[PDB]
């Protein structure tokens, strides 16, 4: 009886570990993405207003 | 007085009643005491470490 309980435990991890990679990698890519669209914004103001 | 004694005793367990119950011969008694306890160990064990994992 126990070792359909270890396979299909195995199965779970086996189909959860990807969900938990591909968010990682969104999270990841989403706060640089910010930070540089943040700085962009910043620097092109200060600019305008430079020339201005 | 020993054969008659014997005799004697087989008569008197002839006459005894009792519920009935089953086994097998003596001469595998031994044997397949060892077997069952290498038996219960060796699902003791298996069961241990599936558990664990």
Known sequence: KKRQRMIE???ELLRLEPQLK???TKYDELKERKSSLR?????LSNLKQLYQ | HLNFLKKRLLQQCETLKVPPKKMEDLTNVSS???ME???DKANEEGLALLQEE
């Open chain 1, 9 to 11: 435990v195995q199965d």
């Open chain 1, 22 to 24: 591909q968010l990682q």
């Open chain 1, 39 to 43: 700085n962009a914004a910043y620097f």
């Open chain 2, 32 to 34: 397949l005491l060892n």
């Open chain 2, 37 to 39: 306890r290498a038996r």
